Design a protein around this ligand. Structure first.
Ligand SMILES: O=c1ccn([C@@H]2O[C@H](COP(=O)(O)OP(=O)(O)O)[C@@H](O)[C@H]2O)c(=O)[nH]1
Ligand SMILES: O=c1ccn([C@@H]2O[C@H](COP(=O)(O)OP(=O)(O)O)[C@@H](O)[C@H]2O)c(=O)[nH]1
Lengths: 272, 272
């Protein structure tokens, strides 16, 4: 493979490492053949969690067919579909070493807390025996390009595609000191999107347990953070900084935002 | 602290991440206040090993006085001085939470294998109960600027200051297939210097055990790698890629190489 070049930046146009030295994952920053090897040597299994409740079951067929084409291909994958409609999960043919489980789910407050509470419950009992990493994403999405082991790390979040260019003042953090998710006006590294985060099983157990326990405190006090579990994810990732950050290549909406020059690939995008 | 800037590279002139997403540590890539916090929260202790054999005891006074001014200040440090002359170790006053132990050492083949064999022995029995990370450096050096927790990671090596600009063909890797340290002409990421490497205790136990066991094989076969334990360190770090790489700011010789523009700081330098 090509020799890395010490006196040429892998990118001239974007930050590729955070000020706490976590990589920011853009095309042109990684050699996938090296990463695939390192992860295959550990026989890595990736768990992918997705919620498909009420009408969202309609997004599963394309989400799964495209995941089969672009997500962790060559590695072991276990999809966990959380749904209120097990009979509406489509039977998608899977590649070798890939499996899918359906987890049936049973008041808008529990609906707001559902993702973090359910991942926390299942992460303890046990995603922990079944996978090495857990990745949580939204279901109204499709994979268009490679999303692979470059993202794997103890803890990651993803730059929200509407905010990667913004000053922190513009970030839609929870701004009321009465909320657990409160971030003051002068703090904040990045604005992470709730639609794509993950990490090792242990770090995901920690994060979801924290967010779930924080949301319950908010509820008991009659406040709901401006962007619900996303507000709390952002507070969590401020205090416990992610070990990689994914660029917006990993979470994009082409209808809303087009295809700007700093994105060399659009890997995982909103469905219209 | 300042908000990271997504659309501005932390550096426009150098690579700051390897193609396996390990940071390459240059000035302007890290915020030390954030890193100091994360490491203090874990009460991190860093072990620093240095050999001072025969006339090299003469380098210890300046090496230690300058380490006190610039190495891991604010964190716990344990110096381990390996020497054939315990009475020639100078009594240098140490800052709080810092300690020094003298380890007395007892045929040019064992001399060649000494660093890796001795660190491996002591790393097992036990640096392992005393520190969280181990850093190994040469003693004929002085600290001139900050060398701190930005370097800490499971496994690191440092770019040799004579080779960071070179194509791999120019790297003085061991080139004879009869050596354990053999690297072919078309392989190699970087040329790491034997004078500054480290990592977690476990990863240093592994690396030194590997290099020691490889050198013995070479000896039994009547070959000595062109650059001795450095040749083997380079073979090791090719097959087990470091999780951070330090730039040549961390290992420089101003007499030989001057002060080029890509070095914003000269942190740890050769003594004339
Ligand atoms: O009735 C619902 C509402 C939400 N969701 C899940 O939670 C995510 C967040 O929903 P939303 O579309 O509101 O997020 P947005 O992309 O519009 O900000 C969805 O992708 C689904 O995975 C669901 O399954 N059923
Ligand atoms: O007689 C010796 C030879 C070597 N060393 C140690 O091993 C390192 C490597 O020595 P050398 O000066 O040859 O390395 P160089 O910087 O010249 O490449 C030295 O810094 C010392 O720490 C020592 O203590 N006594």
């Amino acid at each position: 493979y090509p020799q890395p070049k010490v006196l040429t930046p892998s990118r001239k146009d974007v930050l590729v490492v955070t000020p706490w030295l976590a990589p920011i994952v853009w095309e042109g920053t990684f050699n996938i053949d090296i990463l695939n090897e390192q992860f295959r040597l550990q026989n890595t299994t990736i768990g992918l969690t997705v919620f498909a409740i009420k009408k969202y079951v309609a997004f599963l067929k394309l989400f799964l067919e495209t995941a089969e084409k672009h997500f962790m291909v060559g590695h072991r994958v276990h999809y966990y579909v959380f749904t209120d409609q097990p009979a509406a999960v489509p039977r998608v043919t899977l590649g070798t070493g890939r499996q899918l489980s359906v987890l049936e789910v049973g008041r808008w407050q529990d609906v707001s807390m559902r993702r973090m509470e359910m991942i926390s419950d299942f992460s303890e009992r046990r995603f922990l025996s079944e996978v090495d990493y857990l990745v949580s994403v939204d279901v109204d999405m499709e994979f268009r390009d490679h999303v692979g082991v470059e993202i794997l790390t103890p803890l990651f979040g993803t730059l929200h595609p509407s905010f990667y260019g913004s000053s922190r003042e513009a970030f839609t953090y929870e701004r009321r000191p009465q909320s657990q998710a409160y971030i003051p006006k002068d703090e904040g590294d990045f604005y992470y999107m709730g639609a794509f985060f993950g990490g090792s099983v242990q770090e995901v157990q920690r994060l979801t347990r924290a967010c779930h326990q924080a949301m319950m405190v908010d509820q008991a006090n009659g406040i709901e953070a401006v962007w619900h579990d996303e507000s709390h994810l952002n507070k969590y990732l401020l205090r416990h900084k992610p070990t990689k950050v994914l660029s917006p290549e990993y979470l994009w909406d082409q209808q809303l935002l087009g295809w700007p020059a700093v994105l060399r690939k659009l890997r995982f995008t909103a469905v219209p």
